[PDB]
Structure 1
Amino acid sequence: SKTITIYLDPASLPTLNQLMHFTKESEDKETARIFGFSRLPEKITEQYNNIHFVEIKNNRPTEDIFTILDQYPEKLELDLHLNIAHSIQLFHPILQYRFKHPDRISIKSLNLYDDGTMEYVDLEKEENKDIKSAIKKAEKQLSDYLLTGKINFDNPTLARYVWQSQYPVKYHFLSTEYFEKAEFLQPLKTYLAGKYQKMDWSAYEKLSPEQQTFYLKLVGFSDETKQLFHTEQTKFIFTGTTTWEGNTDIREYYAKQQLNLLKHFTHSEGDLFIGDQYKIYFKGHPRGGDINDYILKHAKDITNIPANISFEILMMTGLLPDKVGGVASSLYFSLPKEKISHIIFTSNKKIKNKEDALNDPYVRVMLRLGMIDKSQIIFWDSLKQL
């Protein structure tokens, strides 16, 4: 028996958690790892004698994974690490490989991690259905999947949660409170009991100094960059965006409005003044380009955070700021209640006003769980020019 640790994610949040798990396990240079990510440092990988990379394509590992495993001719135990929402597809080629060598390969255990809000939005869609029987149904259908390869599930979204019926499993959730307080999911909470933890932004503080550097290197968090967060000053971060349906294609208009929005937080005459307590940071959109240049250019005593550092990374390094606010985005679902200030919704095809904003799926759930109240949702129109 050789154990093979296999990490798979097409998004980014699983990937960060799986990398943390690698970091925890990093003393171990011998065990074999397969990294299937959509988004790793040579000074690190060269330390490991059995390390492989595989492309992800249509939320699965490509058949290259067969070639990689083909290299290990012993009996194998596979430790899998999966994106929860895409778990069934990510699992499939592994299952396909097991069928090819049924005596020699087994699945030792799963770790499953939230893509993001997607899971919650998807579960929110099942509020009317009978959860208790759908779980018994998925269990059956899942057993058929592991025997046959056939993917037929009456409730695909619930199917993602019944893996304990087949394997030792460990879930990592963005919001445990959702399962705990959503009434319709009673039978599921109970069924999952004991097998799930909240995504820890506390694991990075638990690491040794040597492992902390190791993790920072892994995720691309430069030392220079880390510096900007080295100050006992409390910190507020403004969440940028690109454009929206503001009645023009001129990118500098959008930039000028976000500069206006930002001032509503930073300037004392603004409606959302946060106070002189906080050091100001800008976390513009990755796709932002000249919008971001334009805002960085015109805003004063503001520290920029680059595209490579995302909110996810900040949280995994225990570097959440004391407040967050600005343009609305699904990242707000991840923030603790007490870190949120005010959220601004720009007009797009779904959302033309505040009533629509309060109807967005991830928003309903945050309101229902008291992560925010309605005073904190603001429609971009209501704010005046300064």
Structure 2
Amino acid sequence: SKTITIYLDHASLPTLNQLMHFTKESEDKETARIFGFSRFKLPEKITEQYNNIHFVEIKNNRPTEDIFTILDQYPEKLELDLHLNIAHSIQLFHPILQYRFKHPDRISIKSLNLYDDGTMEYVDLEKEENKDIKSAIKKAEKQLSDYLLTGKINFDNPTLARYVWQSQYPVKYHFLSTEYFEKAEFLQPLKTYLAGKYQKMDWSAYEKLSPEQQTFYLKLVGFSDETKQLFHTEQTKFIFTGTTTWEGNTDIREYYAKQQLNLLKHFTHSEGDLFIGDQYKIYFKGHPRGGDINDYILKHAKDITNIPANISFEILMMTGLLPDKVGGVASSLYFSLPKEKISHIIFTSNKKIKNKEDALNDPYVRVMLRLGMIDKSQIIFWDSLKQL
């Protein structure tokens, strides 16, 4: 045997969790690793410490066949420990399966760790709420078994098929919302089925790491000590969530920057409708693509600390640097937040959302409402707020 640890993700949240696993195993400089990521590349000062370390491209929802060339470097019996995105697990896994078929006596899958993409998994499960879940599970297991023996990808319920891997391999799942699985009545049979095999994504692991390992993790994810310092104060913290543009009857980007500055004022100025109080230090998390819009907001906002583009809410979560409060323009990140940290979420106009009613009907917002993460007084339509 050689064991090979293979980390696959085209998104960002599974990557960040997989890098935490790598960090926890980082003293082991021997085991072979394959990193198959879309959005993170590892610093050479880390990678030069590892003698058996490889990188593969993700293209479509799959590792390319360059992974065959990598695995061809290892002619011994191999036992593969796989780490995959839950929503895309079939597609990420398939090239590994094709490779096994080429060397069926020599290559086996040892274990699977599966991690949430994000809201996708929940939005998808919600579409299954009128099905018979118990029989959907037994079907999915038969089909998965065929898929493994032959390679053919046929699932009557692809969404539930994401969750039946334990019928074939040792598996662990890492979920953004364990409450969802435990409180949705229709999923009771899935909950029971998965018992013992899942955990909530641990935002606390960073704080439990040794200082050396914490330094390692920050270096892997590109969190400089400079930027980390912006969060070193005991003052409580509010982060405003920015956006780019929306359907506001003009194409002038500066209009949208001004309007966000007004939304921000509603949180930070004493006579705003959504005033948070003087207790919080104010941070701005602009959209990575805001460019000149973000320049504009930072030029005209007073006493505000910019969070750089490389630092996502996922990174904040994973490093235990979530702030006390988050508010501003709506996006799926709000789903990942504990309820006590959400102030108000402001929806802007697009083709789906034209008013506050449409906002309440958004797929991820519907779950949030049901799980009690927010109430309706927390959902605002951008139009309802006066200029200041």
TM category (shorter chain) comes to: over 0.9
TM-fit CA distance, 1:254: 0.4
TM-fit CA distance, 1:246: 0.5
Q: Deviations over 1:340-369 (max 9, x none)?
A: 000000000000000000000100000000
TM-fit CA distance, 1:37: 0.3
Q: Secondary structure at the match of 2:265?
A: helix
Structure 2 partner of 1:130 = 132
TM-score by length of 2: 0.99
Q: Secondary structure at the match of 2:63?
A: coil
TM-fit CA distance, 1:147: 0.3
Q: Distance in 2 between matches of 1:34 and 1:293?
A: 39
TM-fit CA distance, 1:278: 0.2
Q: Distance in 2 between matches of 1:254 and 1:334?
A: 26
TM-fit CA distance, 1:100: 0.3
Q: Distance in 2 between matches of 1:58 and 1:139?
A: 26
TM-fit CA distance, 1:48: 0.2
Q: Distance in 2 between matches of 1:251 and 1:200?
A: 38
Q: Distance in 1 between matches of 2:139 and 2:251?
A: 50
TM-fit CA distance, 1:102: 0.2
TM-fit CA distance, 1:187: 0.4
TM-fit CA distance, 1:103: 0.5
Q: Distance in 2 between matches of 1:183 and 1:354?
A: 28
Q: Distance in 2 between matches of 1:246 and 1:177?
A: 37
Structure 1 segments unaligned to the other structure (5+ residues):
none
TM-fit CA distance, 1:149: 0.2
TM-fit CA distance, 1:19: 0.1
TM-fit CA distance, 1:385: 0.1
Q: Deviations over 1:208-229 (max 9, x none)?
A: 0000000000000001000000
Q: Distance in 2 between matches of 1:193 and 1:380?
A: 42
Q: Deviations over 1:84-112 (max 9, x none)?
A: 00000000000000000001000000000
Q: Secondary structure at the match of 1:140?
A: helix
Q: Distance in 1 between matches of 2:12 and 2:83?
A: 13
TM-fit CA distance, 1:320: 0.4
Q: Deviations over 1:314-339 (max 9, x none)?
A: 01000000000000000000000000
TM-fit CA distance, 1:164: 0.1
TM-fit CA distance, 1:174: 0.2
Q: Distance in 1 between matches of 2:299 and 2:337?
A: 28
Q: Distance in 1 between matches of 2:358 and 2:184?
A: 22
Q: Deviations over 1:247-306 (max 9, x none)?
A: 111100000000000000000010000000000000000011000000010000000000
TM-fit CA distance, 1:81: 0.1
Structure 2 segments unaligned to the other structure (5+ residues):
none
Structure 1 partner of 2:49 = 47
TM-fit CA distance, 1:201: 0.4
Q: Distance in 1 between matches of 2:289 and 2:90?
A: 30
Counterpart selection for 1:153 from 155, 158, 181: 155
TM-score by length of 1: 1.00
Q: Distance in 2 between matches of 1:206 and 1:231?
A: 20
Counterpart selection for 1:300 from 299, 302, 312: 302
Q: Secondary structure at the match of 1:5?
A: strand
Q: Distance in 2 between matches of 1:173 and 1:115?
A: 9
Matched, 1:341 2:356: no
Structure 1 partner of 2:256 = 254
Q: Secondary structure at the match of 1:286?
A: coil
Q: Distance in 1 between matches of 2:49 and 2:278?
A: 47
TM-fit CA distance, 1:165: 0.2
Percent sequence identity over aligned pairs: 100
Q: Distance in 2 between matches of 1:183 and 1:346?
A: 32
Structure 1 partner of 2:100 = 98
Q: Distance in 1 between matches of 2:167 and 2:219?
A: 37
TM-fit CA distance, 1:371: 0.2
Q: Distance in 2 between matches of 1:240 and 1:190?
A: 40
Task: Spell out the pairing of 1:195-274 with structure 2 (5 A cutoff).
Answer: 195-274=197-276
Q: Distance in 2 between matches of 1:248 and 1:7?
A: 44
Structure 2 partner of 1:285 = 287
Q: Distance in 2 between matches of 1:222 and 1:247?
A: 40
Q: Distance in 1 between matches of 2:180 and 2:161?
A: 18
Q: Distance in 2 between matches of 1:184 and 1:250?
A: 47
Q: Distance in 1 between matches of 2:295 and 2:382?
A: 21
4+ residue runs over 6 A deviation: none
Q: Deviations over 1:85-142 (max 9, x none)?
A: 0000000000000000001000000000000000000000000110000000000000
Q: Deviations over 1:180-224 (max 9, x none)?
A: 000110100000001000000010011000000000000000010
Q: Distance in 1 between matches of 2:67 and 2:48?
A: 20
Counterpart selection for 1:116 from 115, 118, 124: 118
TM-fit CA distance, 1:310: 0.2
TM-fit CA distance, 1:33: 0.3
TM-fit CA distance, 1:17: 0.1
Q: Distance in 2 between matches of 1:211 and 1:283?
A: 27
Structure 1 partner of 2:366 = 364
Q: Secondary structure at the match of 1:179?
A: helix
Q: Secondary structure at the match of 1:288?
A: coil
Aligned length: 386
Q: Secondary structure at the match of 1:8?
A: strand
